[PDB]
A paper describes a structure:
The dedicator of cytokinesis (DOCK)/engulfment and cell motility (ELMO) complex serves as a guanine nucleotide exchange factor (GEF) for the GTPase Rac. RhoG, another GTPase, activates the ELMO-DOCK-Rac pathway during engulfment and migration. The DOCK-A (DOCK1/2/5) and DOCK-B (DOCK3/4) subfamilies specifically activate Rac and have an Src homology domain at their N-terminus; the Src homology domain is involved in autoinhibition and binding to engulfment and cell motility (ELMO) scaffold proteins. ELMO is structurally divided into two domains: an N-terminal domain (NTD), consisting of the Ras-binding (RBD), ELMO inhibitory (EID), and ELMO domains, and a C-terminal domain (CTD), consisting of the Pleckstrin homology (PH) domain and proline-rich region.
We performed 3D variability analysis using the 3.8 Å-resolution consensus map of RhoG/DOCK5/ELMO1/Rac1. Next, to capture representative conformations of the DOCK5/ELMO1CTD/Rac1 core region, we divided the RhoG/DOCK5/ELMO1/Rac1 consensus map into 10 classes by 3D classification. The resulting structures of classes 1 to 5 differed from one another in dimeric molecular dimensions. Structural differences were due to the conformational changes between the armadillo repeat domain and DHR-2 in DOCK5, accompanied by a shift in the PH domain of ELMO1. Consistent with this theory, our cryo-EM single particle analysis reveals that the DOCK5/ELMO1CTD/Rac1 core region is highly flexible and can, therefore, readily transition to a flatter conformation.
Numbering used by the authors:
A (entry chain E): 1 to 269
B (entry chain D): 530 to 727
C (entry chain E): 819 to 1368
Write the structure that this text describes.
């Protein structure tokens, strides 16, 4: 072993399984051991691990899933889509945090909010998995981003965790001290989301009509779905069914009549 | 998932010890336990508090306290943990084999747990329901340093181990674990690191 | 509605003519008509057409300045707080815009037209329940939008030095009242950090102005350093390692985005204290305390930089040691150090590096540094004593252990003869024994306190004047009040013999010195109750055991 060379194209030092304990500085290396390697060998890589960023470990190249990517995914154009990858790394970090507070949780009788955290975690991990692919349309990207940010900041909220701003594109543009007032109004908008969710926890977690009115105040057009199953009537002749919406108080119809042809055999014609 | 499964079940111990410390915390906080045939003005509720030192139990005939454990010197503040032979569960409890005035009926077949001590003294106690009965038995077996006999304990084992490995495989996304481990490339016998260490 | 046209009107009209027409029209507003509405009006005005500024900003703003300065203090600003805040927000934002146009000199015009103004505003606008946070955001956005050269150009170059002195004092009391009683939810950590950075910048600037107008340059009127260090240290009393620790990246997040602000804060304070020079001694005993905590900081490096300041100030006293020595300094040191450490602040590594640094500093120096060596050896003893105390406190949490260790440190102090903190721990142990209802023990403690007291009239030291109540309290009065309470405890302690013993002497003091016979009557009334109790009833004999620890 010799010939180690400093480089910064290894930020994703990827394990393959629990590594053998061959090195004095290596162990049964955990699956997601994204290690900040410092030095390059052809078959091996030694550097900082995520578990201990102050320790080295020489790890096989056949074991490293080499990723030239660094903390920035646009310089090497590693982005599956620009402006979205920051979100996946940040949410992975928050998942680490969620697991830590999870350890903090079961030891205490917070099982209700514990399970609520559980379901939020399931939703987040599945959203993460599906958006790992960029196959979703741009509208889906925006909607996923909005709802995942809402859920994640809510999770921060009831756990008393600090919050982030810049709703879209990595939530990082605003905290980049670009402005100062725009920062304040961003914090205010986020705290507005907070107050929304704290008042609506008792509104949706308990009741179901307030969410309906809130969603219906965002859209103006609606569609009633009617799925006919079978006509139970004793006619013996051809029947025409004029299905429509009607206003009993106004004594008039609200939708155009839908014509159904019914046969004399008990079956539709 | 065969390497995945072997890796998951192979790094067991952390969750096991984790769960058992959770168990012993539950034992320490405890609650009011249940006696035998506490009907004619007998306080069926009574707290059994483990020491935060986890060596002595604070228990005895305390009042019918709905609040549960109350911090004070119980009727007996010692259960000698170093000489508990076992706790019998079910028909092995002799108090169920009682056929006189202390006849326990057939609805407490799963709430029977008698702590063995003094080689003749026992503690035939009842649990409000099965889950915490198994919980207390798990905690005591942890004091015995042994296996856990709560179904909920196996539930936690499985769910948390599965979560933990689940949140590990994010690094291997779009990658595969060879069932045969990758060959270890030859390491040159010299350790003369051309670059400086650390 | 009229702002709605300004965009395309500009698109087909002279920019500056439009500008001046709108200016004259707004000036045509009579001074008491529809304030909020016009505020919204020029809000929309500064919204657009302010992308092109060099021809309008310099002429639009003067008007805005005039009306906002009217909004400064007319005793009827109550309706316009939120609206004026909105205006400030929008204008400061569009000024923060870079591509819009060059404004640095116009930023200055804003300085000299708005800065003292908003300062006086927040002075009046001083309540926290309202939307004060918006104003705070506006003023910090101002302060970060500035430049040090800016800060200097006129705000540092005002009229007579008295005015600027008063202004600086007002700013400093403001900053202290801001960092203290913080205005944020404690969740907007980004806001807290940014506010810290900008306050750091501003206090830096006001530090250089203090240097360049108020050092021996201003040979006199040199008090305000008390306020300045107060504010600085208070600013150095949050956002510490543990809050930084919550997530491991939390340390990393802050150090990447901001670094350890505390580091340069302490370095600035250090070099400033060095800069004080001849005024150090005139300024030491008060500010002795304010530096321990920054020395106590859980970090390493600025501590390494900060302990030497202790030798520097005892050196300053050594220059003054022609009359006495640093007895004054070391007394405050001991007192403070005691209460901070017992506050659960220090750690042993601190003590080791303290000893190292002070000893090394003393070695290069003379006899008085040897006296400092022996006193700091005493200090190290105190440090290890307190550390043992606190580790047992946090380790056992039993009444027995905590009383044991506090009695140990009590005896230690009695040896060290710093009677005041000795009394403090006396009262601590009193609290403990009362919590255990050990009336006998508690009353004995109060007795030990009263032992040092005399029946004289003159209150000889305010050291015996405690925090429970504080006024004249003639030595006689404090002694008798203590005795009274001790008697109460013995009575509910069922030990009436000692109650009688002290009742006698309370009575004789009444007779020979105060002649207040009503106290006699009540005192001996209780005395009779005591004799009745003792002959009449019976009480159990406590058992005694021998405990051999091995």
């Amino acid at each position: 072993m010799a010939r180690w060379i400093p480089t910064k194209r290894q930020k994703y030092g990827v394990a393959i399984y629990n590594y053998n304990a061959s090195q004095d500085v290596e162990l049964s290396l955990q699956i997601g051991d994204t290690v900040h390697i410092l030095e390059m060998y052809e078959g091996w890589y030694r550097g900082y691990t995520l578990q201990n960023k102050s320790k080295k470990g020489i790890f096989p190249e056949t074991y490293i899933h080499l990723k030239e990517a660094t903390v920035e995914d646009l310089g090497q154009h590693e982005t599956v889509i620009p402006g979205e990858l920051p979100l996946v790394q940040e949410l992975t970090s928050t998942l680490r945090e969620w697991a830590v507070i999870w350890r903090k949780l079961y030891v205490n009788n917070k099982l209700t909010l514990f399970r609520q955290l559980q379901q939020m975690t399931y939703s987040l991990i599945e959203w993460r998995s599906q958006i790992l692919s960029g196959t979703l349309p741009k509208d889906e990207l925006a909607e996923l981003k909005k709802k995942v940010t809402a859920k994640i900041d809510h999770g921060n909220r009831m756990l008393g965790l600090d919050l982030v701003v810049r709703d879209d594109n990595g939530n990082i543009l605003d905290p980049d001290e670009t402005s100062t007032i725009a920062l304040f109004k961003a914090h205010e908008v986020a705290s507005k989301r907070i107050e929304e969710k704290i008042q609506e926890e008792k509104s949706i977690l308990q009741n179901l009509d307030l969410r309906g009115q809130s969603i219906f105040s965002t859209i103006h057009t609606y569609g009633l779905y009617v799925n006919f199953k079978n006509f139970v009537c004793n006619i013996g002749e051809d029947a025409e069914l004029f299905m429509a919406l009607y206003d009993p108080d106004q004594s008039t119809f609200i939708s155009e009549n839908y014509l159904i042809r019914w046969g004399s055999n008990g079956m539709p014609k | 998932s065969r390497p995945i499964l072997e890796l998951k079940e192979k790094i067991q111990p952390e969750i096991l010890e984790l769960i058992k410390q959770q168990r012993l915390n539950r034992l320490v906080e405890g609650t009011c336990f249940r006696k035998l045939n506490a009907r004619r003005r007998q306080d069926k509720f009574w707290y059994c508090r483990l020491s935060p030192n986890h060596k002595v139990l604070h228990y005895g005939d305390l009042e019918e306290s709905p609040q549960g454990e109350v911090p004070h010197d119980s009727l007996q503040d010692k259960l000698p943990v170093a000489d508990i032979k076992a706790v019998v569960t079910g028909k092995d409890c002799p108090h169920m084999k009682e056929k006189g005035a202390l006849k326990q009926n057939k609805e407490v077949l799963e709430l029977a747990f008698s702590i063995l001590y003094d080689s003749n003294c026992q503690l035939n106690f009842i649990a409000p329901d099965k889950h915490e009965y198994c919980i207390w038995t798990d905690g005591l077996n942890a004091l015995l340093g042994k296996d856990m006999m709560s179904d909920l304990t196996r539930n936690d084992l499985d769910t948390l181990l599965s979560m933990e490995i689940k949140l590990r495989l994010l690094d291997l996304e779009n990658i595969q674990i060879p069932d045969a481990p990758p060959p270890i490339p030859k390491e040159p016998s010299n350790y003369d690191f051309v670059y400086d260490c650390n | 509605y009229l702002p709605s046209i300004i965009n395309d009107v500009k698109l087909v009209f002279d920019p500056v003519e439009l500008s001046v027409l709108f200016c004259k029209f707004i000036q045509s507003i009579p001074d008491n008509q529809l304030v909020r509405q016009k505020l919204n009006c020029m809000t929309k005005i500064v919204e657009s057409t302010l992308f092109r500024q060099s021809e309008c900003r310099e002429v639009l703003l003067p008007l805005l300045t005039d009306q906002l300065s009217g909004q400064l203090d007319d005793n009827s600003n109550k309706p316009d707080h939120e609206a004026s805040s909105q205006l400030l927000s929008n204008i400061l934002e569009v000024l923060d815009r870079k591509d819009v146009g060059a404004t640095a000199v116009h930023i200055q015009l804003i300085m000299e037209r708005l800065l003292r103004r908003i300062n006086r505003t927040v002075i009046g606008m001083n309540r926290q329940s309202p939307h004060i946070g918006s104003f705070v955001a506006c003023m910090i956005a101002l302060l970060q939008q500035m430049d040090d050269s800016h800060y200097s150009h006129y705000i540092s170059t005002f009229k007579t030095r008295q005015d600027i002195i008063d202004f600086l004092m007002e700013t400093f009391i403001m900053f202290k009242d801001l960092i203290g009683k913080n205005v944020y939810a404690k969740d907007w950590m980004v806001m807290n950090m940014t506010q810290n950075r900008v306050f750091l910048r501003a206090i830096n600037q006001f530090a250089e102005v203090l240097t360049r107008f108020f050092m021996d340059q201003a040979s006199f009127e040199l008090q305000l350093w008390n306020n300045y260090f107060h504010l600085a240290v208070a600013f150095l009393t949050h956002e510490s390692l543990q809050l930084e620790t919550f997530s491991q990246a939390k340390r990393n997040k802050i150090v990447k985005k901001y670094g350890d602000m505390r580091k340069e804060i302490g370095f600035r304070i250090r070099d400033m204290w060095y800069n004080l020079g001849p005024h150090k001694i005139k300024f030491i005993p008060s500010m002795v305390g304010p530096i321990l905590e920054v020395t106590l900081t859980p970090e390493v490096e600025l501590r390494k930089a900060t302990i030497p300041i202790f030798f520097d100030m005892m050196q300053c006293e050594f220059n003054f040691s022609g009359n006495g020595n640093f007895h004054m300094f070391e007394n405050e040191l001991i007192t403070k150090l005691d209460q901070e450490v017992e506050g659960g602040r220090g750690d042993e590594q601190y003590k080791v590096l303290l000893e190292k640094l002070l000893l090394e500093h003393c070695r290069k120096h003379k006899y008085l540094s040897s006296s400092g060596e022996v006193f700091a050896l005493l200090v190290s003893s105190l440090l290890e004593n307190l550390l043992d105390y606190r580790t047992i406190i946090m380790q056992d949490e039993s009444k027995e252990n905590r009383m044991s260790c506090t009695v140990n440190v009590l005896n230690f102090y009695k040896e060290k003869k710093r009677e005041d903190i000795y009394i403090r721990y006396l009262y601590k142990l009193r609290d403990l024994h009362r919590d255990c209802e050990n009336y006998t023990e508690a009353a004995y403690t109060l007795l030990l306190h009263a032992e040092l007291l005399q029946w004289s009239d003159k209150p000889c030291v305010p050291h015996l004047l405690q925090r429970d109540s504080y006024y004249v309290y003639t030595q006689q009065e404090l002694k008798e009040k203590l005795y009274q309470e001790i008697i109460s405890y013995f009575d509910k302690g069922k030990m009436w013999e000692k109650a009688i013993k002290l009742s006698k002497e309370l009575a004789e003091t009444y007779e020979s010195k105060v002649f207040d016979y009503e106290g006699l009557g009540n005192l001996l009334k209780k005395r009779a109750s005591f004799y009745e109790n003792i002959i009449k009833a019976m009480r159990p004999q406590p058992e005694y055991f021998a405990v051999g620890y091995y």
